[PDB]
Ligand binder design. Structure first.
Ligand code: GSP
Ligand code: MG
Lengths: 494, 334
């Protein structure tokens, strides 16, 4: 009898925990809805305003700060942003590094979605000014908004989160990249739903950023800048099922050691002296993706099969020490060395780097197997590998989110974007640690990495046929990404 | 949605999938000017292809009548001119060339280049087509050839049963789109140009069309997301196969050497009056895909071969009648 009452109370507690865990990865509407091809959650929603925002000056703000201080500052800033999202009727998607993005009109339609996004961006600039005042920082917001059709849903099985995928989302990311710190960079489409209530000026993308590798003046697309305006057993079974659901949804957000550390403190922050990051992008997905049939939804279903395949790699016993951080469009983000809280006896100090490298190789194999099931089209995986100190942290109190920050993640994303398809590009220090472990690398050349200038990069699969001559890529010009990838939040600005 | 049968038409290029869609529209279901325009475009494409291939064949084919030589040059002159108005001079020159014996001899060697399937049908109808009041018949619409790019959907109803036909493109560059229709698909209808055993595909001009279809069917049958999807094999272009077999100019064994040792199966059910050679060739082509299907037929899905002639309305009606019960049975199995 008393056991039944205790089971009921703890079942209410665990139901609340599961609801909170679901709310952290899905919108309240979809979260309430929850309560051959793998299951695929995606819908085509029109008239959605997508907003991206980058913390300009993040690299200097995070310099010479401990993990606790940096994670606290990020938590304060993102809490202000979340309050702003609640006020402006926007829906925050996720935060990546120094980036914050949201959608208005998704999943619930809004007639003033463009207004919601513009107001939220302007408020974010104001809140960043307040954050600078209170925290004695010098940072700004570079906001970019574009309105169009999105495909919103869930990709993959592990660390899945509600996100938005479309050419319009990529265009909004482009708007953010080409924008000005402290101003909202709206696309030509967004200005069609806006009246004269804002102080609007020409975007001047061609004048400011000079070259436009995306197209000739955004392929003839204008842009604007806005600066402002029996009973016991049954109860035991039920509570066991609810607890399994709650802990599985908690594992979907934060790693297991982070779960242990969060049982005592409401905040988590760790400084890892040695951690490895890989960014694995699917380069030619844009070639595969086509909006002609069902807005491209079915195409992303194919992507849902590939990412989920990567999610089956984490279940292997060999890759238990590897944590998937996030998936960004067609990019897979993974890390290693975070779980190594205790130095296990007999283990190499850099064994996590070897395990992460083997994970990247197995991702290459998985991509090959996936292409074996495609009809005269081959998906190409491009992996960037780096290692070094980083800062891991949980962002938020109600809606949890695990993330990592530092020059290590930035350099890993740089090797992902500057790498070559079907090969793994590892950083210089990553080469120095991997090659000592029996791995062979081809010296690709030097890549322009911020804070290191020309830094040597090594492509993993040593092509016996022909030779990889030093490319010596010195391109320091702004790398404008025409699609959502791992560079989101991993490329600090002025 | 649960009560409708999603039939995805697959197969290599120019297999006949669009003609099967047209047959479904004819049976169970401004624009006429467009249809006439594509018919005339097919006519022009056929005549220019034959004329150009006359000098490109090995050995080159000379004109039977030298006085028609200039008639060739005009055809060469306007080969690459888009938005052709099709003047009466063009129609007269095309008819005169088609009545020339050298052009016909070049046409008999159409397997040595890439020629559309509706060549002879429209080159024998030039006089009717050239009229300003030309009304295209149902057979004329069925014979018209238009390359299909993208995914097209046709919804029709037979005996209060809903069918959703997904027509795709058969060329390699289009096959990457096919996976967009592999989800919740009731059936796959794999159309094969059975008469194309002596022809090479347009993509590289080297791979045999029937071998390309066999490779494509191997890929489809052994697909990860089509493991439990039964494939209804449409062995199409049976009439052209019969003409090619009775002609004897392009033997089946000269491109598939295993046909020489092949023998007609005892379960064969030829149509009355059918030549034994046509029966043997068509059943060899059927068994070529049956081998692939049985190489991985672990009981999850089955191959249903049908000898179809897409331009034949009655034959396609009978084939679809024979396939409706199979389709509903597999929908139940889903
Ligand atoms: N004689 C005869 N001709 C046929 C038959 N089936 C199709 N054809 C002709 O062959 C030509 C090519 O067929 P088509 O319908 O375009 O194949 P397809 O697979 O849809 O072509 P694609 O766009 O994917 S490349 C058409 O002109 C059509 O008239 C048939 O059974 N008998
Ligand atoms: Mg077609």
């Amino acid at each position: 009898v008393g056991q039944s009452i205790m089971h009921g109370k703890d079942l209410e507690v665990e139901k609340a925990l599961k609801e909170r865990m679901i709310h952290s990865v899905m919108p309240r509407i979809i979260a309430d809805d929850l309560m051959a091809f793998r299951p695929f959650k995606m819908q085509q929603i029109e008239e959605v305003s997508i907003l991206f925002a980058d913390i300009v000056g993040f690299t200097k703000m995070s310099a010479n700060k401990s993990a606790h201080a940096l994670v606290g500052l990020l938590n304060d800033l993102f809490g202000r942003f979340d309050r702003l999202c609640e006020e402006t009727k926007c829906e925050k998607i996720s935060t990546l590094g120094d980036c914050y993005y949201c959608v208005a009109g998704c999943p619930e339609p809004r007639a003033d979605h463009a207004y919601c996004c513009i107001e939220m961006g302007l408020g974010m600039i104001k809140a960043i000014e307040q954050f600078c005042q209170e925290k004695k920082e010098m940072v700004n917001m570079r906001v970019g908004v574009h309105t169009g059709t999105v495909l919103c849903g869930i990709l993959g099985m592990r660390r899945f989160k509600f996100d938005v995928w479309s050419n319009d989302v990529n265009l909004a990311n482009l708007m953010e990249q080409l924008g000005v710190a402290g101003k909202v960079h709206i696309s030509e489409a967004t200005a069609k739903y806006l009246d004269d209530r804002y102080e609007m000026e020409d975007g001047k993308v061609i004048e400011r950023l000079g070259q436009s590798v995306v197209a000739d003046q955004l392929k003839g697309l204008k842009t604007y800048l806005i600066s402002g305006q029996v009973e016991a057993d049954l109860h035991r079974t039920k509570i066991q099922s609810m607890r399994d659901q709650a802990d599985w949804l908690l594992r979907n957000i934060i790693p297991y050691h982070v779960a242990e550390q969060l049982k005592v403190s409401q905040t988590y922050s760790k400084n890892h002296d040695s951690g490895g990051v890989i960014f694995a992008s699917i380069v030619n997905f844009s070639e595969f993706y086509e909006e002609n049939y069902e807005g491209g939804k079915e195409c992303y279903r194919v992507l849902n099969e590939l990412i989920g395949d990567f999610d089956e790699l984490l279940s292997k016993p060999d890759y238990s020490s590897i944590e998937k951080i996030k998936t960004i469009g067609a990019t897979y983000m993974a890390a290693s060395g975070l779980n190594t809280a205790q130095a296990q006896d007999g283990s190499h100090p850099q064994e996590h780097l070897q395990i992460l490298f083997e994970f990247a190789k197995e991702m290459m194999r998985v991509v090959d197997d996936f292409n074996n099931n495609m009809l005269w089209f081959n998906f190409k995986l491009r992996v960037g590998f780096n290692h070094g100190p980083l800062t891991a942290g949980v962002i938020g109190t109600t809606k949890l989110l695990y993330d990592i920050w530092g020059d290590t993640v930035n350099i890993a994303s740089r090797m992902d974007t500057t790498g070559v398809e079907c090969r793994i590009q590892v950083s210089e220090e990553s080469y120095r640690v991997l090659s000592k472990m029996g791995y062979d690398f081809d010296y690709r050349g030097t890549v322009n990495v911020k804070g290191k200038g020309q830094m040597k990069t090594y492509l993993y699969p040593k092509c016996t046929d022909h030779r990889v001559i030093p490319q010596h890529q010195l391109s320091i010009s702004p790398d404008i990404r025409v699609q959502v990838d791992g560079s989101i939040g991993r490329s600090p600005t002025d | 949605y649960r009560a409708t049968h999603r039939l995805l038409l697959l197969g290599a290029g120019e297999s006949g999938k669009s003609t099967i869609v047209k047959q479904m529209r004819i049976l169970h279901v401004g624009e006429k000017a467009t249809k006439v325009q594509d018919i005339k475009n097919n006519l022009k494409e056929a005549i220019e292809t034959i004329v150009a291939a006359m000098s490109n064949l090995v050995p080159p084919v000379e004109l039977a009548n030298p006085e028609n030589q200039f008639r060739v040059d005009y055809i060469l002159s306007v080969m690459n001119v888009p938005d052709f108005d099709f003047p009466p001079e063009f129609y007269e020159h095309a008819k005169a060339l088609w009545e020339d014996e050298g052009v016909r001899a070049c046409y008999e060697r159409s397997n040595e280049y890439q020629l559309i399937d509706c060549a002879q049908y429209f080159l024998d109808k030039i006089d009717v087509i050239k009229q300003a009041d030309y009304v295209p018949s149902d057979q004329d619409l069925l014979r018209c050839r238009v390359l299909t790019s993208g995914i097209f959907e046709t919804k029709f109803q037979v005996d209060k049963v809903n069918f959703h036909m997904f027509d795709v493109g058969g060329q390699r560059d289009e096959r990457r789109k096919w996976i967009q229709c592999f989800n919740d698909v009731t059936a796959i209808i794999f159309v094969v140009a059975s008469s194309s055993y002596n022809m090479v595909i347009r993509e590289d001009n080297q791979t045999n069309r029937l071998q390309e279809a066999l490779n494509l069917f191997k890929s489809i049958w052994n697909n990860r997301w089509l493991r439990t999807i039964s494939v209804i094999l449409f062995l199409n272009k049976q009439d052209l196969l019969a003409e090619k077999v009775l002609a004897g100019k392009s033997k089946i064994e000269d491109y598939f050497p295993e046909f020489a040792r092949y023998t007609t199966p005892e379960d064969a059910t030829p149509e009355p009056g059918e030549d034994p050679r046509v029966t043997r060739a068509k059943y060899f082509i059927r068994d070529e895909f049956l081998r692939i299907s049985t190489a991985s037929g672990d009981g999850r899905h089955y191959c249903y071969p049908h000898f179809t002639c897409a331009v034949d309305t009655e034959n396609i009606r009978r084939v679809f009648n024979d396939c409706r019960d199979i389709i509903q049975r597999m929908h139940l199995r889903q």
